[PDB]
Design an enzyme around this catalytic site. Structure first.
Site, PDB file in Angstrom:
ATOM      1  CG  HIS A  64      39.771  37.400  21.135  1.00 28.80           C
ATOM      2  ND1 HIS A  64      39.148  38.498  20.610  1.00 28.80           N
ATOM      3  CD2 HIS A  64      40.177  37.750  22.418  1.00 28.80           C
ATOM      4  CE1 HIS A  64      39.132  39.484  21.536  1.00 28.80           C
ATOM      5  NE2 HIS A  64      39.775  39.030  22.636  1.00 28.80           N
ATOM      6  CG  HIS A  89      45.269  29.769  18.017  1.00 26.72           C
ATOM      7  ND1 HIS A  89      46.385  29.974  18.725  1.00 26.72           N
ATOM      8  CD2 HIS A  89      45.368  30.556  16.856  1.00 26.72           C
ATOM      9  CE1 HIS A  89      47.165  30.874  18.072  1.00 26.72           C
ATOM     10  NE2 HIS A  89      46.527  31.234  16.935  1.00 26.72           N
ATOM     11  CG  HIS A  91      43.988  32.838  13.115  1.00 27.66           C
ATOM     12  ND1 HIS A  91      43.738  33.898  13.909  1.00 27.66           N
ATOM     13  CD2 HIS A  91      45.163  32.265  13.583  1.00 27.66           C
ATOM     14  CE1 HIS A  91      44.716  33.991  14.834  1.00 27.66           C
ATOM     15  NE2 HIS A  91      45.578  32.993  14.629  1.00 27.66           N
ATOM     16  CD  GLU A 102      46.501  35.268  11.839  1.00 25.30           C
ATOM     17  OE1 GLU A 102      47.409  34.695  12.489  1.00 25.30           O
ATOM     18  OE2 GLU A 102      45.889  36.307  12.230  1.00 25.30           O
ATOM     19  CG  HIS A 115      48.903  30.006  14.162  1.00 26.65           C
ATOM     20  ND1 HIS A 115      48.358  31.278  14.163  1.00 26.65           N
ATOM     21  CD2 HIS A 115      49.570  29.871  12.960  1.00 26.65           C
ATOM     22  CE1 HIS A 115      48.651  31.885  13.014  1.00 26.65           C
ATOM     23  NE2 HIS A 115      49.405  31.048  12.277  1.00 26.65           N
ATOM     24  CB  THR A 196      48.890  37.220  14.380  1.00 20.95           C
ATOM     25  OG1 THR A 196      48.034  36.205  14.933  1.00 20.95           O
ATOM     26  CG2 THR A 196      50.109  36.579  13.660  1.00 20.95           C
TER      27      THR A 196
HETATM   28  N1  LIG Z   1      48.637  33.587  15.853  1.00 22.72           N
HETATM   29  S1  LIG Z   1      49.309  33.662  17.497  1.00 22.72           S
HETATM   30  O1  LIG Z   1      50.052  32.322  17.489  1.00 22.72           O
HETATM   31  O2  LIG Z   1      50.397  34.750  17.536  1.00 22.72           O
HETATM   32  C1  LIG Z   1      48.300  33.717  18.921  1.00 22.72           C
HETATM   33  C2  LIG Z   1      46.961  34.003  18.782  1.00 22.72           C
HETATM   34  F1  LIG Z   1      46.451  34.302  17.560  1.00 22.72           F
HETATM   35  C3  LIG Z   1      46.190  34.020  19.931  1.00 22.72           C
HETATM   36  F2  LIG Z   1      44.895  34.346  19.700  1.00 22.72           F
HETATM   37  C4  LIG Z   1      46.749  33.720  21.220  1.00 22.72           C
HETATM   38  S2  LIG Z   1      45.658  33.766  22.654  1.00 22.72           S
HETATM   39  O3  LIG Z   1      45.183  35.248  22.745  1.00 22.72           O
HETATM   40  O4  LIG Z   1      44.393  33.157  22.073  1.00 22.72           O
HETATM   41  C5  LIG Z   1      45.805  33.109  24.362  1.00 22.72           C
HETATM   42  C6  LIG Z   1      46.780  31.944  24.530  1.00 22.72           C
HETATM   43  O5  LIG Z   1      46.260  30.820  25.207  1.00 22.72           O
HETATM   44  C7  LIG Z   1      48.126  33.396  21.343  1.00 22.72           C
HETATM   45  N2  LIG Z   1      48.733  33.117  22.621  1.00 22.72           N
HETATM   46  C8  LIG Z   1      50.055  33.652  23.015  1.00 22.72           C
HETATM   47  C9  LIG Z   1      50.035  35.025  23.740  1.00 22.72           C
HETATM   48  C10 LIG Z   1      49.230  35.183  25.023  1.00 22.72           C
HETATM   49  C11 LIG Z   1      50.159  35.017  26.234  1.00 22.72           C
HETATM   50  C12 LIG Z   1      49.993  33.666  26.922  1.00 22.72           C
HETATM   51  C13 LIG Z   1      50.006  32.465  25.981  1.00 22.72           C
HETATM   52  C14 LIG Z   1      51.271  32.514  25.113  1.00 22.72           C
HETATM   53  C15 LIG Z   1      50.942  32.526  23.617  1.00 22.72           C
HETATM   54  C16 LIG Z   1      48.894  33.407  20.139  1.00 22.72           C
HETATM   55  F3  LIG Z   1      50.212  33.098  20.089  1.00 22.72           F
HETATM   56 ZN   LIG Z   2      47.354  32.230  15.524  1.00 24.03          ZN
END
Ligand SMILES: NS(=O)(=O)c1c(F)c(F)c(S(=O)(=O)CCO)c(NC2CCCCCCC2)c1F
Ligand SMILES: [Zn+2]
Ligand SMILES: NS(=O)(=O)c1c(F)c(F)c(S(=O)(=O)CCO)c(NC2CCCCCCC2)c1F
Ligand SMILES: [Zn+2]
Lengths: 261, 260
Positions: A64, A89, A91, A102, A115, A196
């Site tokens: 993702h 990460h 986007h 975003e 982010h 998001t």
């Molecule tokens: N834009 S975002 O900051 O809200 C976001 C992502 F877009 C995202 F893709 C992720 S994640 O799925 O890639 C996996 C995290 O390593 C998180 N991570 C959050 C939510 C998942 C729960 C555990 C990590 C806490 C942050 C995340 F926070």
């Molecule tokens: Zn993000």
């Protein structure tokens, strides 16, 4: 399985992830009508952003996005509780339409968005646990535009070509994350929002800096072409592109700025 | 039901209607990268738009928008099939954020948007039957910005106080519907999309005109404040505001323009 394109796309996320169809959703369009100056808004301070060069941090294409894990000793100060780093990460969009931030600003999509995810470590034992809990997360958002080459971002973009497929893992030598911040970090937008991505929990304090950073045409192209959303063994590859969620309604909500105009 | 807010708002539409979480969804942001000029796009011709001043047409608050019924004699020419009118209706924001167009241009929401819905009457017997078929619908969009009073739009608005609650109805005498259209109607965006409301079928030939119209600030405030999603006997009432869908991913499609 959730995507950013198709029937498992963002409009269908609510099906398996109810919060995606819920309150306080992110991102938002940043425009004057919902903006309010708040002079109680003080600069953040960044601690333990200087990761050891003599150590290496886990980069992961998770199907993702591409994420770098971060050590919990890195934290920000200037918010109500301690917020400790967990991951960063990006986007972005695609070469046809290189406007995949975003958040948007007076309706303008920037090129991409970085982010830096922090969790609430005064209250919760980890990020995973904090994510589902109130005021449990805090995200810093850096807007990215096209321009000059960026040696600091390259410190991430050079390991991309080696984590091209889903579930793959690789190592960046630790560096000074503040190098990934823009000019005048004291000038920012602040508001209450959500993750998001599924599962979209409404648990995020967003800070989006007013100023963007610049990476070059080629790094931008590189980021947009390097990765796939699918595993090595998948018969139906999919390029990782357009991995931004559309902006959300902002009803009965207000975005607070640390800066006047 | 389905709303523009709350746990039954847009991100949940797909749990009720499969098409809203499908491909080719409308509306979309109209921006430079994805516009392609197409000299092939000729001006539309509007037939039977000068409605009989001598006939009344039904204006209904349906709990989602205000819609005016249109005669099946009203049609567009210029396309591959004949498209005949079924209704027109609008979308808008709220007094605190008066930016409620469905289509945006270079990321900018206009105050409001007028939609004139047609069905393919060469292929199909009526709108509802045509709503789920190939080349089923053609909709005209007119972008609305706040400004000078508009006599023609008041031929609809002046009646707003009569359709305040859901299920409530007024009768409107005929005027020329072409008076609602912006200038240089030859100049437009064109693309294949969907219904912007449920059931969201991807069966709409969209035509958005390049030039906005103006209505006055009084006229827009009436539109933002007169109407309610709930019935008159609802004393737990919902204001009819922000009745527009967020812009959709549109990233294999191009939007064709008739102007450069
Ligand atoms: N834009 S975002 O900051 O809200 C976001 C992502 F877009 C995202 F893709 C992720 S994640 O799925 O890639 C996996 C995290 O390593 C998180 N991570 C959050 C939510 C998942 C729960 C555990 C990590 C806490 C942050 C995340 F926070
Ligand atoms: Zn993000
Ligand atoms: N944005 S739109 O032009 O695609 C639109 C609406 F926003 C809209 F609200 C309606 S609605 O007034 O009828 C209430 C939604 O149920 C229609 N109506 C068309 C689509 C409905 C199905 C088949 C008949 C064609 C009319 C409609 F077409
Ligand atoms: Zn409409």
């Amino acid at each position: 399985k959730w995507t950013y394109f198709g029937p498992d796309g963002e409009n269908s996320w609510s099906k398996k992830y109810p919060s995606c169809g819920g309150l306080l959703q992110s991102p938002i369009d940043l425009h004057s009508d919902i903006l309010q100056y708040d002079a109680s808004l003080t600069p953040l301070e960044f601690q333990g952003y200087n990761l050891s060069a003599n150590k290496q941090f886990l980069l992961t294409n998770n199907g993702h996005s591409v994420k770098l894990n971060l050590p919990s000793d890195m934290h920000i100060q200037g918010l109500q509780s301690r917020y400790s780093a967990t991951q960063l990460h990006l986007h972005w969009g695609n070469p046809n339409d290189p406007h995949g931030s975003e958040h948007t600003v007076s309706g303008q999509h920037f090129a991409a968005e970085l982010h830096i995810v922090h969790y609430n470590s005064d209250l919760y034992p980890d990020a995973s646990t904090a994510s589902n809990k109130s005021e449990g997360l805090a995200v810093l958002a850096v807007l990215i535009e096209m321009g000059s080459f960026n040696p600091s971002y390259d410190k991430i973009f050079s390991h991309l070509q080696h984590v091209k497929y889903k579930g793959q893992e690789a190592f960046v030598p630790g560096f000074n994350i503040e190098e990934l911040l823009p000019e005048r970090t004291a000038e920012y937008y602040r508001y209450r929002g959500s993750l998001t991505t599924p599962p979209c929990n409404p648990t995020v304090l967003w800070t989006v800096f007013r100023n963007p950073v610049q990476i070059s045409q080629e790094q931008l192209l590189a980021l947009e072409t390097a990765l796939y959303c699918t595993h090595m063994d998948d018969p139906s590859p999919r390029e990782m592109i357009n991995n931004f969620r559309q902006v959300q309604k902002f009803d009965e909500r207000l975005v607070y700025t640390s800066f006047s105009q």
